[PDB]
Design a protein around this nucleic acid. Structure first.
Ligand SMILES: *[C@@H]1O[C@H](CO[C@@H]2O[C@@H](C)[C@@H](O)[C@@H](O)[C@@H]2O)[C@@H](O[C@@H]2O[C@H](CO)[C@@H](O[C@@H]3O[C@H](CO[C@H]4O[C@H](CO)[C@@H](O)[C@H](O)[C@@H]4O)[C@@H](O)[C@H](O[C@H]4O[C@H](CO)[C@@H](O)[C@H](O)[C@@H]4O)[C@@H]3O)[C@H](O)[C@H]2NC(C)=O)[C@H](O)[C@H]1NC(C)=O
Lengths: 79, 233, 98, 94, 107, 97, 80, 108, 94
DNA sequence: GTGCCGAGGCCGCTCAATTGGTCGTAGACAGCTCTAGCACCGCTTAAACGCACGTACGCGCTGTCCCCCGCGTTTTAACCGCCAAGGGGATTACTCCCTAGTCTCCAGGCACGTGTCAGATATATACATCCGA
DNA sequence: TCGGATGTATATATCTGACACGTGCCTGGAGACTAGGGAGTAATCCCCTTGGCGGTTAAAACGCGGGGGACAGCGCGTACGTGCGTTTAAGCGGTGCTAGAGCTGTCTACGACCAATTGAGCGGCCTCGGCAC
């Protein structure tokens, strides 16, 4: 299960271009993959905790929204 | 209006064409108290795209003191032409607003298609519409009484008059902090209470309260200006 | 054999992707990664589509902001190339790895 | 089917007040509803903390006004305070 | 009884005063809630909604669009200093980012 | 005529001030500054001693953290001297700008 | 009324030394004074708002603690 | 009646279960507060206090001092990863800072 | 004067249980009291939000456990959960 | 220019908001009181301020070459349109056990009083460390 | 690479004030009930989640060429750290005044609560034009 490589180098390059980055080093992609993995781990852990507390086997959008809001990353558009 | 805010007999409602340059009404007809009461307790006239200016100022302006009545909107637009002001589209471009070019675009901008046809018939192109006419023909802003162009112009001018004034009351060194706090408690209702014989006066935002006695209070409840901060020792 | 300068197409992409609102990461790989990560907390988990979409939006916004901060850090060091030390410095100052 | 309430009708009414011709999309409605709920929760929590600090059991207009002054930045707080004061005065009159 | 009249109509607003009052009463904020608090809260919410909606409509008009999409909301929020300060830690879905390129990166 | 090389006394002061817990800003000037700032918000405002002390502690901690971030920023640029640009970059990244 | 100069250059140098700074530029002091003034303005404004809501004329330490907690700077040891 | 026993004594806790229950009931948290919530909360608070006090006492012993001052609390908080994460945005009065100097600034 | 309660004597008992010889000062006691109050407020607020999210009007031990898991990081959450479960089981046994 | 799917408009209906009275308690107000914050005043004196020097460092210029960008080609799997099964979210009814509420009372916790022992403050000494020679 | 010389940690006296213990009191937590409704537990419905398949083609991977920018020297001025002499309010300690924070007693009016009524808004269903193609 190696799915962190699913975030390809062109995708990271596109995300950097949206951020105004002109030139990218070759070692940036691994660092970005690690940062994304850490962020997703935290958010998903909080969402799964919220889901278990609700006695459910399905992760809903409200759980993710609450998990993001708990981290000071309020997200608008999903409830 | 009299002390009870009722119509004051005789002549409770006088046509405007009979009050222009008439100081004898101020002198011999009870002074300024009824006039201030009428100003405070009478609704203004709403600006609608089919009701712009009344016929008193449009047909009979300064009728008594002139050989013929004047036309105030016509005078406004003739003065704009005399001053050599640019047209409606130039000022829309100046304020950063879209400039209509056809009758459909002008109708969309004005939100009144029939008014757009009338303006197109009179002028022929939106670039030639006079500044006053285009400004007063625009739909009013929410909680406002001017269009986006007029609001832009007036806001810019008053921002310049405020920031460019050295003796602005909020500027440091003009008034002391205690004096500024004392001045922050003033109100036109309090001035009217102090300087006239009117004892019942509209509440806060005197420019909004217009119906007696729903938005009127007693003059004694208004806080007074405390001048003790002006004492020099 | 018309070849652009090594900086023209990068600026063109910067202008193109700063004017759009789409998602820059393919949806299926991100969904697979999210499921793989969630496998570490609770087995036999089901995900709503809106949940995965919200996770993707949050991750993309976070990465874009981090890359803006990283660009600021790189420009501070008199450079135009984005380097991992810039990312580490940005994460420290933000308070993430601090 | 249960009934889910949201600030969609009121946001649409305000939009028609501001932009009679311009319409709105579904995602824009969702964002508007989330924003309204978030601001409501922030102001209510600040007012509740203000009431708890002063040992009061009642949330009044003063607590809401102080919470608005504390949270909303710059001229936004002043304008919101003026609008709320006008609304409260109008309601008290009627 | 007399004909019913909504409290929002009495206060001259369009946001629901009664719904806000019910949410305050059942939201575990205080033991009691005053009668003027819902009116003030509804007025503030309506003012903020009107501000952001007006800015978003202006942004949509600047793009020659008839409808408001989340991109217009993001453009309205991020271009206003006070709204940006208020919604600083808030992510708007499908909002994009403000077009901004650093000067040093230009040719 | 003995003389220490430039930098030794700086490290000595770093080691001395990272060990003590005393406040590094004079109390009376900070009290005067706090009163001058608070004058813009209210007249005849009275301050508790604990209020001024808490303000001083919070301000000193905030400035120390800001200087740590500034030192990191200056070191990132291959420098040992902190500059206002480092402070501005740190405050931007923190989000205070 | 120029009390911002009461935060002398040696005090800023001491604060930098506590932060681990070895060398300090000459223009750092004005930037530090401005940052301190901004931070104090925000905190004191919030504290004065809290005091005014309480119908009090004395700013207590608890108001400062509440203000700092509002900015996200919870302070321990003063009040509670 | 009978000899009154504190609810903390039944749970083997040194923290007040009754005071925590009263604070939960009057804290505008929820309409109803269960019977087992105060015990759980008191136990969690007692564990956290015991851990932080153990670390602070260890730091004070390393400093050959008997009484605990805020400097020891700051050292204990900042020298533990979990406690530092829990108290990242918290300023401890009279705590100072952890002694560190960058390697490049070192004389060489 | 009036009675102002704090977690001082309980903190002293815990310290005596951990370190039977060392003492504590007044400022350290104030810091510990503030820390206890802050953690109490955090956990109670998280439990209240959890109860509101699930449309429940009761704060139970499960809500407190989930709040502890959400706030306390790493091994702290596990150890606190173990201690709380042990205390609840002991209390309900007697 | 196309058209189609999402925004806009219309109709049940039902539950939530409105209207009309009571109760009791939370909050407003007047009064006393006695902390505690504010305003002089003198003396050290520690710290701030001013200044000269020189040396380490910030900044600019130059050359390498290697690492990253741009483009063509091939491969890969993302993406999209249907199809099916079914696990599980969501709603409904019964009831019972858990929690709010109340009178009694008594003991744990808080305010006050005090003394002595950890701790803050000189002092001479022994090193710890740094800088030419 | 060693002598002086500057700074700092250390062991030893020496006051000292605040932390820990003891005591009186009071008020809130516990004991023993009653009442009611929140939710726990089954049961059922359908929906949206997952797995599968195949066809298009958009995109990712790979390789090659080249240029420009990251990085290492090298120099040069300059400005900041270090040390010394002069100045200045910071701090300490006492003294006096009174402003206002806090507690106490009365009282009233305002929000919670309850019952009856009805219409506002929510879901379902068309319908057409704003916008993606
Ligand atoms: C053709 O050029 C037109 C003029 O171009 C000018 O000259 C060229 C060479 C460029 O330098 C160009 O930038 C110049 O503007 C151009 O029309 C211009 O459009 C701009 C942008 O919409 C207008 O500026 C706006 O003006 C008003 C008023 O503010 C100004 O005037 C007052 C008084 O003089 C000053 O105090 C101000 O500082 C400004 O000078 C405002 O409506 C607005 O500012 C507010 O709005 C914007 C967004 O709405 C906010 O970002 C701001 O913060 C403010 O809230 C703008 O400043 C400019 O007036 C107008 N010029 C003229 C002469 O009409 C046009 O677009 C070009 N045509 C095409 C097809 O490109």
């Amino acid at each position: 299960r190696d799915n962190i490589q699913g975030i390809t180098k062109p995708a990271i390059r596109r995300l950097a271009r949206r951020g105004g980055v002109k030139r990218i080093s070759g070692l940036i992609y691994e660092e970005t993959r690690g940062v994304l993995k850490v962020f997703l781990e935290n958010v998903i852990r909080d969402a799964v905790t919220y889901t278990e507390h609700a006695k459910r086997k399905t992760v809903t959008a409200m759980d993710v929204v609450y998990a993001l809001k708990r981290q000071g990353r309020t997200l608008y558009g999903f409830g | 209006l009299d002390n009870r805010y009722q119509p004051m007999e005789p002549n409770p409602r006088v046509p405007l064409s009979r009050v222009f340059f008439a100081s004898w009404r101020v002198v011999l007809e009870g002074g300024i108290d009824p006039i201030l009461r009428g100003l405070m307790a009478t609704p203004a006239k709403l600006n609608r795209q089919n009701q712009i200016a009344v016929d008193e100022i449009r047909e009979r302006l300064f009728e008594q003191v002139m050989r013929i009545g004047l036309d105030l909107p016509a005078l406004n637009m003739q003065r704009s032409r005399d001053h050599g002001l640019p047209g409606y589209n130039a000022w829309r471009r100046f304020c950063g607003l879209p400039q209509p070019e056809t009758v459909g675009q002008l109708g969309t901008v004005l939100r009144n298609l029939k008014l757009a046809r009338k303006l197109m018939e009179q002028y022929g192109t939106p670039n030639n519409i006079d500044i006053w006419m285009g400004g007063v023909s625009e739909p009013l802003k929410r909680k406002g009484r001017v269009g986006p162009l007029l609001a832009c112009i007036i806001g810019t001018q008053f921002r310049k008059l405020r920031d460019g004034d050295r003796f602005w009351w909020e500027n440091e060194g003009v008034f002391s902090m205690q004096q500024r706090q004392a001045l922050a408690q003033i109100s036109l209702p309090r001035i009217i209470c102090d300087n006239t014989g009117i004892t019942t006066v509209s509440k806060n935002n005197i420019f909004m309260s217009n119906s007696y006695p729903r938005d009127f209070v007693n003059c004694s409840t208004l806080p007074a200006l405390n001048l003790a901060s002006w004492r020099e020792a | 054999p018309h070849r652009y300068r090594p900086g023209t197409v990068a600026l063109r992409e910067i202008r193109r992707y700063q004017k759009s609102t789409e998602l820059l990461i393919r949806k299926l790989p991100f969904q697979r990664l999210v499921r793989e990560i969630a496998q570490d907390f609770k087995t036999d988990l089901r995900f709503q589509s809106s949940a995965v979409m919200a996770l993707q939006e949050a991750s993309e916004a976070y990465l874009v902001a981090l890359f803006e901060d990283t660009n600021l850090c790189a420009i501070h060091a008199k450079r135009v190339t984005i380097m991992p030390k810039d990312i580490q410095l940005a994460r420290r100052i933000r308070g993430e790895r601090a | 089917k249960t009934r889910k309430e949201s600030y969609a009708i009121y946001v649409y009414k305000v939009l028609k007040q501001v932009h009679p011709d311009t319409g709105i999309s579904s995602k824009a409605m969702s964002i508007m509803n989330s924003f309204v709920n978030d601001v409501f929760e922030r102001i209510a929590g600040e007012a509740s903390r203000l009431a708890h600090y002063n040992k009061r059991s009642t949330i009044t207009s003063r607590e809401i006004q102080t919470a608005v002054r504390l949270l909303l930045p710059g001229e936004l707080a002043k304008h919101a305070v003026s609008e709320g004061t006008k609304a409260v005065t109008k309601y008290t009159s009627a | 009884r007399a004909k019913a009249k909504t409290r929002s109509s009495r206060a001259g607003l369009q946001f629901p005063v009664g719904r806000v009052h019910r949410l305050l009463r059942k939201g575990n904020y205080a033991e009691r809630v005053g009668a003027g608090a819902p009116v003030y809260l509804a007025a503030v919410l309506e003012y903020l909604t009107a501000e952001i909606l007006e800015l978003a409509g202006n942004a949509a008009r600047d793009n020659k669009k008839t409808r408001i999409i989340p991109r217009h909301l993001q453009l309205a929020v991020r271009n206003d200093e006070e709204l940006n300060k208020l919604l600083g830690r808030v992510t708007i879905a499908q909002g994009g980012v403000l077009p901004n390129i650093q000067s040093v990166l230009l040719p």
